[PDB]
Amino acid sequence: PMGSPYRDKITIAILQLQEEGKLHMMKEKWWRGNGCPEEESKEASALG
Amino acid sequence: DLAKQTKIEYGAVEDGATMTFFKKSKISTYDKMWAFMSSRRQSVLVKSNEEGIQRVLTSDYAFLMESTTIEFVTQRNCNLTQIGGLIDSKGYGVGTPMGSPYRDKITIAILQLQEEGKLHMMKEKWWRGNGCPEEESKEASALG
Amino acid sequence: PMGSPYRDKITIAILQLQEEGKLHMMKEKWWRGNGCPEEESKEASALG
Amino acid sequence: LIVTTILEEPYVLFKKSDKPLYGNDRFEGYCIDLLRELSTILGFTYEIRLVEDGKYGAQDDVNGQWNGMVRELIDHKADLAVAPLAITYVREKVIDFSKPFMTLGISILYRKPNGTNPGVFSFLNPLSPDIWMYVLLACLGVSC
Amino acid sequence: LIVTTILEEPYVLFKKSDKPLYGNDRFEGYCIDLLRELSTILGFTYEI
Amino acid sequence: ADTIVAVELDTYPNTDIGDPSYPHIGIDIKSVRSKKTAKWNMQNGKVGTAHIIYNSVDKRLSAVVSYPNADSATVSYDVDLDNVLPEWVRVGLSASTGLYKETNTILSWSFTSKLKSNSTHETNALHFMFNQFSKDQKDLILQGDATTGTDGNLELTRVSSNGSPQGSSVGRALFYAPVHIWESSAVVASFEATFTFLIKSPDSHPADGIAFFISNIDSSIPSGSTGRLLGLFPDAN
Amino acid sequence: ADTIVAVELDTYPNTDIGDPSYPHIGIDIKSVRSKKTAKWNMQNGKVGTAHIIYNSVDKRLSAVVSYPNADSATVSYDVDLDNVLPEWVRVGLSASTGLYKETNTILSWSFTSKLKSNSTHETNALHFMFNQFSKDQKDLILQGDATTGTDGNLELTRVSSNGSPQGSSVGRALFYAPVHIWESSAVVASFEATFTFLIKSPDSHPADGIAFFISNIDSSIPSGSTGRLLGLFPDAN
Ligand SMILES: *[C@@H]1O[C@H](CO)[C@@H](O[C@@H]2O[C@H](CO)[C@@H](O[C@@H]3O[C@H](CO[C@H]4O[C@H](CO)[C@@H](O)[C@H](O)[C@@H]4O[C@@H]4O[C@H](CO)[C@@H](O)[C@H](O)[C@H]4NC(C)=O)[C@@H](O)[C@H](O[C@H]4O[C@H](CO)[C@@H](O)[C@H](O)[C@@H]4O[C@@H]4O[C@H](CO)[C@@H](O)[C@H](O)[C@H]4NC(C)=O)[C@@H]3O)[C@H](O)[C@H]2NC(C)=O)[C@H](O)[C@H]1NC(C)=O
Ligand SMILES: *[C@@H]1O[C@H](CO)[C@@H](O[C@@H]2O[C@H](CO)[C@@H](O[C@@H]3O[C@H](CO[C@H]4O[C@H](CO)[C@@H](O)[C@H](O)[C@@H]4O[C@@H]4O[C@H](CO)[C@@H](O[C@@H]5O[C@H](CO)[C@H](O)[C@H](O)[C@H]5O)[C@H](O)[C@H]4NC(C)=O)[C@@H](O)[C@H](O[C@H]4O[C@H](CO)[C@@H](O)[C@H](O)[C@@H]4O)[C@@H]3O)[C@H](O)[C@H]2NC(C)=O)[C@H](O)[C@H]1NC(C)=O
Ligand SMILES: CCCCCCCC/C=C/CCCCCCCC(=O)O[C@@H](COC(=O)CCCCCCCCCCCCCCC)COP(=O)([O-])OCC[N+](C)(C)C
Ligand SMILES: CCCCCCCC/C=C/CCCCCCCC(=O)O[C@@H](COC(=O)CCCCCCCCCCCCCCC)COP(=O)([O-])OCC[N+](C)(C)C
Ligand SMILES: CC(C)CCC[C@@H](C)[C@H]1CC[C@H]2[C@@H]3CC=C4C[C@@H](O)CC[C@]4(C)[C@H]3CC[C@]12C
Ligand SMILES: N[C@@H](CCC(=O)O)C(=O)O
Ligand SMILES: [Ca+2]
Ligand SMILES: [Ca+2]
Ligand SMILES: [Zn+2]
Ligand SMILES: [Zn+2]
């Protein structure tokens, strides 16, 4: 809210998590899903 | 990769936030770099970023630094590049003293400059890409 | 030594570390060195 | 106000002019042109001053004190820190940052390896230079 | 809790630096990192 | 940067930055771009006998370097240390190596100043005669990667892999006590030295040179001085 | 308590702590209770000439003081400097007063040690000759309330109250650099001194004596020394 005693406590706390890397660990925990098998997965090409 | 070869010297800038990240890190790869860099602490830790540029141009040195200054170097020197991805994410804050009335008024005035593109029109001006061979664009390689 | 009050304290303690995986984390911290570039690194073969 | 800063290309750098540059005239770059626009919005008067010790800011962890622009802010010598002063965990505890005007990332500056071109006698490469003689001595031999 | 150890890489080895170190911090390797973890869980001083 | 004046016994030819085409003696005034140079024979691991005077009644800064059965390297440049070097200074030795190998072993070092209360009013001194550099010599502020002891020697290198002198290493040997100079009580202090050294060949075409500086009372190894900058200068101009 | 060996030129009888009924030159081995004393004449504002040696060819720790047209007080006590005083020292001057005032102006000071690198082979030295104490003499670690400058003088009292030097004042004048002694390369370290003082008559029974010590490398004013403790002792033992 408009002036809170919990902004600066979290502002320091978010900076701790990306220093430890846990904001990157939780990033790779949810956004990483199936690899979405790429366009370079030809494996066969009968010329048509 | 870069933590596991002592063939290439690598350091950072002294009194800076790059080596402060490695000084306080506890993950195995980045502490291994700080286990490397703490030994030859004078040999690899250069004084400013400009000496961090120049000792890559001369020696077999790989300099750890920020992305937004690599964006200005590699658009000027077309033999240097950004090896690897972003290690972490940080930002440039307009620093104010502890408990200031100008913290919030600049917090307004940065967001106002960002929604109307002023913080992008200035970055396009002062980084001035200049033309540079970007890549061979690794693909099929039609014989000239 | 031949009968110690510190065997069983470590016997439980070693089992904690491989459950957490730190015996594997310290394994990959020291035995992993340079990749020793493999025999499948041909890159050129002029026929002689 | 008194705005501390530091030379770092292309953020803050001296302006190229022959005249006896006065006050704020000698400075040009990104971060002062940021502060040229922050001064129009908030309606104040900045007055650029360098950092004295020439560092950014770091904890000397012997006396537990600070250097650089961070020490310039805690002692209230200069009111802003419009600079490439990054946002880290150990700096936010002692001074107050604004929101970022730029997003960073730590990475590696290193030389591009030189891609020596496959010069115009490239098609002789798939056989060794003694085998091309052995074929030539064959068609000079078998024909005889 | 006197710990008798014998120098073999990469298990224990001397920590190289500019300034010479003195005591338990002279040593590094796998078995030093193991004995730190045993001293963290159980809780005991150790003299190499 | 610290204002620093040295007498470089440089061994790497740098026609880039003003070192001549040969291994030389050189005399530096606040710049690695020297003032005078002279040819020096540069024999292998042998003894040393170098010497520096600066008598302000003659205002030359002469020097010689002598092996046995060799010749003197007279590099006397006319410079006045009135205005080019601070009031209270800190003398000492500087050595370096980089991308090559060479030995930087000092075996003895001395000094003698005599500075003018009112010229015949019993001039001061700071004479010392370190022939026997010991293990825990605590009147030296040896910086860099410089060591001492293990013999009567001053080993200004990371050394002792059969002495193979471990390239890209910088060593300094700052003496502890200051010396009044500027002029101010005028500057007739004929400060002598003796700079016995042993530059042994590692069979490597050995080249990065030893120095003898006169720095400010506060110094360090500035921002990388391993190499052609030769242990003390920050900048190559 | 720091280990310290001094030569008290005590200008005040201290009968409670072993100083004799007469003002005296003394000698100290970790004790304000002196080993050996001798009668000193203690003239008014005049000058100076003191001299202290210890040659281990004779192992006598001697000290002499002479005004011009006065005698000499040989107070030589054989003491073994092997074990009574550490390897590395920090020599200097010490002076104090208390409840009686006196001027303790030193106006020149020297020192000359010579310790056996290998007895013939070019022993070490630390010769200096401070005849010209400056206003900003930055090779003195002058402690306490010692002053300097404003003339060629070393004023080891809070002075310039018309030369009535503000009683219960104390000021030490430690030299900046350490000296090798203990034995280790045995103990012929014939340290010399020359200690030209000035003790002005305050018309107030001039009193509390000047010293010349050889202390530990770390030192300060011990626990308050304005008086009988003479500037350098914590206790009266
Ligand atoms: C019995 O009743 C006592 C009541 O007097 C009582 O009090 C006192 O107790 C303290 C211990 O707690 C102890 O004090 C000593 O007194 C010494 C002599 O008195 C001097 O000085 C005192 C100042 O302390 C003055 O108050 C006196 O009047 C007298 O000095 C006069 O001073 C003026 C100055 O303007 C002169 O003009 C006068 O001419 C002079 N009159 C005289 C000399 O008759 C005192 O000196 C002791 O001080 C010592 O340390 C000080 C620190 O540097 C220096 O002053 C100096 O070093 C002193 O050393 C003594 O100095 C004497 C010269 O004054 C010399 O004999 C020697 O150099 C040295 N003495 C010795 C023996 O070595 C100290 O303060 C006394 O016990 C006592 N004071 C007395 C008697 O004055 C007692 O506790 C009661 N009980 C008992 C059991 O006695
Ligand atoms: C992109 O394109 C550039 C093209 O330039 C390429 O980058 C180049 O990489 C080169 C790496 O070699 C670098 O080379 C310069 O070499 C010359 C040649 O002289 C010697 O210089 C050094 C030693 O003095 C060595 O690094 C050189 O390799 C060469 O010496 C040989 O070194 C052998 C190993 O030490 C040695 O074997 C033993 O050595 C000892 C000691 O020397 C004894 O001799 C012993 O008996 C030997 O057994 C060889 O004998 C030795 N041979 C000779 C003839 O000496 C040189 O000019 C330079 O180094 C000198 O100059 C610098 C200038 O400051 C000075 O500081 C040094 O101390 C040294 O005196 C270089 O090393 C090129 O500079 C560099 N180019 C650029 C622009 O950076 C890249 O490879 C390309 N990228 C790709 C392909 O991806
Ligand atoms: C199946 C048919 C067999 C025929 C038998 C006869 C074969 C006899 C051949 C014998 C040897 C010939 C090749 C030499 C070896 C090549 C490797 C090399 O290092 O050379 C190099 C130097 O460039 C040269 O010098 C190449 C030689 C030029 C002559 C080629 C004549 C064509 C063959 C005659 C045919 C005529 C018709 C035949 C009869 C009707 C080439 O490589 P590069 O590209 O320069 O790399 C450097 C580039 N860079 C500097 C930028 C980095
Ligand atoms: C019966 C049996 C026979 C009897 C024995 C007889 C004795 C014969 C024994 C021979 C022994 C072998 C000696 C030669 C070795 C060469 C290999 C080498 O490394 O050098 C180089 C060869 O590159 C060339 O330059 C080749 C010459 C041009 C090619 C054209 C020749 C044929 C043309 C068409 C033929 C028409 C066919 C018509 C058919 C009817 C490669 O290295 P490089 O980097 O390029 O070096 C550059 C050198 N240069 C600077 C000078 C250029
Ligand atoms: C018909 C004639 C003219 C053809 C050319 C000459 C022939 C006979 C000669 C020239 C060089 C010779 C080769 C030289 C080297 C080797 C490697 C050895 O481990 C096996 C034999 C082998 C593989 C030889 C086989 C025969 C060879 C190819
Ligand atoms: N410019 C950074 C330091 C250098 C870096 O972290 O790359 C800062 O001021 O925090
Ligand atoms: Ca050189
Ligand atoms: Ca006394
Ligand atoms: Zn040179
Ligand atoms: Zn006494």
Residue numbers in the entry:
A (entry chain B), C (entry chain D): 769 to 816
B (entry chain C): 673 to 816
D (entry chain C): 433 to 576
E (entry chain D): 433 to 480
F (entry chain F), G (entry chain E): 1 to 237
Please give me the paper's original passages concerning this structure.
Kainate receptors, a subclass of ionotropic glutamate receptors, are tetrameric ligand-gated ion channels that mediate excitatory neurotransmission. Each KAR subunit has a multi-domain organization, including the amino-terminal domain (ATD), involved in receptor assembly and trafficking, the ligand-binding domain (LBD) that binds agonists, competitive antagonists and positive allosteric modulators (PAMs), the transmembrane domain (TMD), which forms an ion-conducting channel, and the carboxy-terminal domain, which determines surface expression, synaptic localization and interactions with intracellular proteins. Here we present cryo-electron microscopy structures of the kainate receptor GluK2 in the presence of the agonist glutamate and the positive allosteric modulators lectin concanavalin A and BPAM344. Concanavalin A and BPAM344 inhibit kainate receptor desensitization and prolong activation by acting as a spacer between the amino-terminal and ligand-binding domains and a stabilizer of the ligand-binding domain dimer interface, respectively.
The ConA-bound group of GluK2 particles includes two subgroups, with one or two ConA dimers bound. The most compositionally complex GluK2–Glu–ConA–BPAM (GluK2Glu–ConA–BPAM) structure has an overall two-fold rotational symmetry and two bound ConA dimers. The core of GluK2Glu–ConA–BPAM is a GluK2 homotetramer with the ATD and LBD layers assembled as dimers-of-dimers where A–B and C–D dimers of the ATD, as well as the A–D and B–C dimers of the LBD, are arranged symmetrically around the overall two-fold symmetry axis, with domain swapping between layers. A distinct feature of GluK2Glu–ConA–BPAM compared to GluK2BPAM is a marked separation of the ATD and LBD layers, emphasized by an increase from 59 to 75 Å in the distance between their centres of mass (COMs) and lack of the ATD–LBD interfaces in the A and C subunits that are present in GluK2BPAM. Instead, the ATD and LBD in the A and C subunits are connected through ConA dimers acting as extension spacers. One protomer in the ConA dimer contacts the ATD, whereas the second interacts with the LBD. The ATD–ConA contact is mediated by carbohydrates attached to N378, the glycosylation site conserved among GluK1–3 subunits. The type I ConA–LBD contact is mediated by carbohydrates attached to N546, the glycosylation site conserved among GluK1–3 subunits, and the type II contact appears to also involve carbohydrates attached to N751, the glycosylation site conserved over all GluK subunits. In addition, the role of ConA as a spacer between the ATD and LBD layers appears to be an elimination of ATD–LBD interfaces in subunits A and C that might restrain the activation-associated expansion of the LBD tetramer.
